[PDB]
Amino acid sequence: PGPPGPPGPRGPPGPP
Amino acid sequence: PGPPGPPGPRGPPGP
Amino acid sequence: PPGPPGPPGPRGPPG
Amino acid sequence: MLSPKAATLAERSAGLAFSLYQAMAKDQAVENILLSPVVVASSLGLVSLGGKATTASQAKAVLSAEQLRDEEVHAGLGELLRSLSNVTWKLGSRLYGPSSVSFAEDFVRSSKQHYNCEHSKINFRDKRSALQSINEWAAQTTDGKLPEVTKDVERTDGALLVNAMFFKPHWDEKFHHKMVDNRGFMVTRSYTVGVTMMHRTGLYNYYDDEKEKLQIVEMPLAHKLSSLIILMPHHVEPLERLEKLLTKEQLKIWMGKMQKKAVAISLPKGVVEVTHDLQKHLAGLGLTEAIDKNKADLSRMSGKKDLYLASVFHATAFEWDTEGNPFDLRSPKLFYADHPFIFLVRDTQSGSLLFIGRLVRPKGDKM
Amino acid sequence: MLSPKAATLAERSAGLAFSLYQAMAKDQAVENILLSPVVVASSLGLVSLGGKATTASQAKAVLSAEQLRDEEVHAGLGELLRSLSNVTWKLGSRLYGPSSVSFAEDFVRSSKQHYNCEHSKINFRDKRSALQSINEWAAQTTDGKLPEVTKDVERTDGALLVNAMFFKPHWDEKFHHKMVDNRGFMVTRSYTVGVTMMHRTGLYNYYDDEKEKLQIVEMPLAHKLSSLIILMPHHVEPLERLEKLLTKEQLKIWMGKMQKKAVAISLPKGVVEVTHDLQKHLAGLGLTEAIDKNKSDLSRMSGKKDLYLASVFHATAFEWDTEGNPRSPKLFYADHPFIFLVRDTQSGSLLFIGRLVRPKGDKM
Numbered sequence: 001p002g003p004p005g006p007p008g009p010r011g012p013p014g015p016p
Numbered sequence: 017p018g019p020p021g022p023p024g025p026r027g028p029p030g031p
Numbered sequence: 032p033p034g035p036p037g038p039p040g041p042r043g044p045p046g
Numbered sequence: 047m048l049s050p051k052a053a054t055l056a057e058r059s060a061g062l063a064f065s066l067y068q069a070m071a072k073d074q075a076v077e078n079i080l081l082s083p084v085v086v087a088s089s090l091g092l093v094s095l096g097g098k099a100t101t102a103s104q105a106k107a108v109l110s111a112e113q114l115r116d117e118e119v120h121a122g123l124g125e126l127l128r129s130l131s132n133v134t135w136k137l138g139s140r141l142y143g144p145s146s147v148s149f150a151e152d153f154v155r156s157s158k159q160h161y162n163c164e165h166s167k168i169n170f171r172d173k174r175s176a177l178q179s180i181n182e183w184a185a186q187t188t189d190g191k192l193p194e195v196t197k198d199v200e201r202t203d204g205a206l207l208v209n210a211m212f213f214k215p216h217w218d219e220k221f222h223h224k225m226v227d228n229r230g231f232m233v234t235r236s237y238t239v240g241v242t243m244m245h246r247t248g249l250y251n252y253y254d255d256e257k258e259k260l261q262i263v264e265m266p267l268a269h270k271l272s273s274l275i276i277l278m279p280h281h282v283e284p285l286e287r288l289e290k291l292l293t294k295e296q297l298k299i300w301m302g303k304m305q306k307k308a309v310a311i312s313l314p315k316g317v318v319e320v321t322h323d324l325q326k327h328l329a330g331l332g333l334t335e336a337i338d339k340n341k342a343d344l345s346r347m348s349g350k351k352d353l354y355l356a357s358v359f360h361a362t363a364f365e366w367d368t369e370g371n372p373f374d375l376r377s378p379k380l381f382y383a384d385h386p387f388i389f390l391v392r393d394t395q396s397g398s399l400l401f402i403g404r405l406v407r408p409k410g411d412k413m
Numbered sequence: 414m415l416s417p418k419a420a421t422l423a424e425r426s427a428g429l430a431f432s433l434y435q436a437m438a439k440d441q442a443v444e445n446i447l448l449s450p451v452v453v454a455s456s457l458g459l460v461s462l463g464g465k466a467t468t469a470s471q472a473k474a475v476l477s478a479e480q481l482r483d484e485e486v487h488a489g490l491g492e493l494l495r496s497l498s499n500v501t502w503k504l505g506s507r508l509y510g511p512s513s514v515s516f517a518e519d520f521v522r523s524s525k526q527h528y529n530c531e532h533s534k535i536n537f538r539d540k541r542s543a544l545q546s547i548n549e550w551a552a553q554t555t556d557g558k559l560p561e562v563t564k565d566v567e568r569t570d571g572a573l574l575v576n577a578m579f580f581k582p583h584w585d586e587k588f589h590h591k592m593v594d595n596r597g598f599m600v601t602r603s604y605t606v607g608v609t610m611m612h613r614t615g616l617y618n619y620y621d622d623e624k625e626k627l628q629i630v631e632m633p634l635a636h637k638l639s640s641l642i643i644l645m646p647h648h649v650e651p652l653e654r655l656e657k658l659l660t661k662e663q664l665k666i667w668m669g670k671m672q673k674k675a676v677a678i679s680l681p682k683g684v685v686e687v688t689h690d691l692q693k694h695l696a697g698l699g700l701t702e703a704i705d706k707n708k709s710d711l712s713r714m715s716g717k718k719d720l721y722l723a724s725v726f727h728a729t730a731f732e733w734d735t736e737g738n739p740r741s742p743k744l745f746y747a748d749h750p751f752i753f754l755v756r757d758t759q760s761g762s763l764l765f766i767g768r769l770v771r772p773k774g775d776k777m
Contacts, residue, residue, distance in 0.1 A: 001017075001032075002017050002018030002032045002034060003018045003033050003034065004019050004020070004021050004022070004033070004037075004247070005019070005021035005033050005034035005035045005036050005225075006225055006227065006243075006312065007022045007023065007025070007037050007245065007310050007312060007382065008023050008024035008036050008037035008039045008040060008677075009024045009036070009040070009677060009744070010024050010025050010026075010039070010040055010230075010232075010384055011025065011026050011039050011041045011042050011043060011746075012042045012043065012744050012746045013028045013030055013043045014028065014042060014044045014045045014046065015030045015045045015599075016030040016045070016046045017033070017034050017035070018033050019591060020034050020036070020589055020592050021034060021035070021036050021245075021310075022037045022310060022378065023039070023040050024036075024037065024038070024039050024040035024380075024382065025380050025382045025384075026040050026041050026042075026043055027040060027041065028043045028232070028281070029044045029045065029046055029281075030044075030046040032224065033222055033224050035589065036614065037592075038592055038594060038610075038612035038679065039677050039679060039744055039746060041597075042597075042746065042748055227741075228740050228741040229741050230741050240740070240741050241741075
């Protein structure tokens, strides 16, 4: 029971 | 508790 | 009670 | 509903606030912006009210109301200020004049009547007490949400117009009180700040411009009487590019392109404090004589040319909170505001712009 | 609790595993590395036990146990193997020699006593059936998690020691069963593989070295009895640079610098199967005579110079699963190669050392 949670955090940065 | 939330946004690009 | 936050988003694209 | 004259003044108020926003956004020293079109317009109304000759004519010209009687201007602006009232909104306007000066009865009565103007004397010979009293007046007006207007007053020999505000958007569909956590807000690609974020998934009017690489979302406020519009680029970049695109016409295009979609809105939670001194920017919009000690005629205000417009402090505490009405999706689109964005508070019935601003750097520490 | 002698052997076993790891990491043929220090030490122990003269002295020297009596090395490695048994863990040690040779009663008794080394005679010239039986022994030992040790055995003429293991870290704080999705693991900057990743945010002992551009995380295992340590550079880069930094002393420094922080851990999920033939690498560390047919003196094993050590198969199936007990996070996003360690909390004893460079999956 209960609604879904928030989205997760932003993903890590890409390679240079 | 409810189910886990959706994945977060894609990360930023590299330099 | 709301569920936990979802997973982190995918890695960003290259530069 | 607004009277036809108030409606036309409201359109000019919006246009003026867009011009003011653009002017300030070009300044590299300016981070966050927060403008109430009505309060900006009411400030020009006081200049018309208190002034004579060119000093007053410029104020009416900036307001594009030169063909109207002074009474019509004051009544219309008064009506607009009154219309902002529809707890979650707090406003105070105070005119500070030097100890030596005396405000005129007629002006004092008229400014109370149309602009809800409070009047005070200030003694900058004791700068600490002068600042203390302005900042305290603002703290009380906003019940501590705006604890300080300015740390210093540059120009001490003139009149000081201070507008102190507190605005807290109350959502038509509230955020869950537990849908709040700590995240990182990206001020730049190299600079992150620790913030509290609040989260909600629902049906929202949404548009993703793949061509201009931006997202637009409409969040209705209590009883759909007004709505909060958020404009944010896809990537973390300076708002300059988006700001170039931001026009009354472009906004109309974007809003027509919006549709009701499942959206996971994630926003920073907390109070954003912004204090602008509009003085320099209003002069750039045509209000030249009022801000000049040698040319200012504010004699309807004090009885003598012993006054000039030294400052116009537009100070706001905008609170992003979970609160809203109880009233209330498998794969939502993300509107994850962890980077700078532009926002607008629009009145649903009129179309009248209540707020225009941007959040570039929220409160928090570096990481 | 370990006896003082077993504790000192454990320190040498760890140091040996660090040396073995470094030796292997330099080899461009080596991808994934999975080593159990105890089991590695127990293999040198058998060479000391079965070999004599230089063949045995080298075995003790590799282990850096030359200053100990032979009985101290054997008894203490036995106690260490025994203490490990208490998380899912499965081990099997087995000596395969040619069907013609004869295992000495004295060695058979001692090998089973200290190292639990079962003995089996097998025809190696009978390749498919030879492989089939070793691979079945490993499958049964591990309950099918390690279905294959090797695809080929090159030396039909000598002795083969095979270690088959299954290890599944059971987390002190489990991952949510739905916190699992498909992502891309970057083997190289030009090569990505499709993996299943599992995700969890919690309080973990963490350290971010800004100077050396690396992250270190401690994930306690069931009842905090042991913990899994992960070392990974900030960016995708071959582990060579990190491996240069990796020492017993540097690890001690990093762990002292760790503190309890909110960490969002993302790890590949699945069974990683690793089969090493330690033979070549142990020879590089000093075990030269035992692996050479012409110099090997394993006469304490087979009563005569009719034996050499063809191979030492260190075979492990390490399972990364969600199962375990019921501020703004830092990301520990393991989508590129990382180094890992399983440490016993009470002793400090290193249970595993390894690296995941290429997980199971297809190219994308």
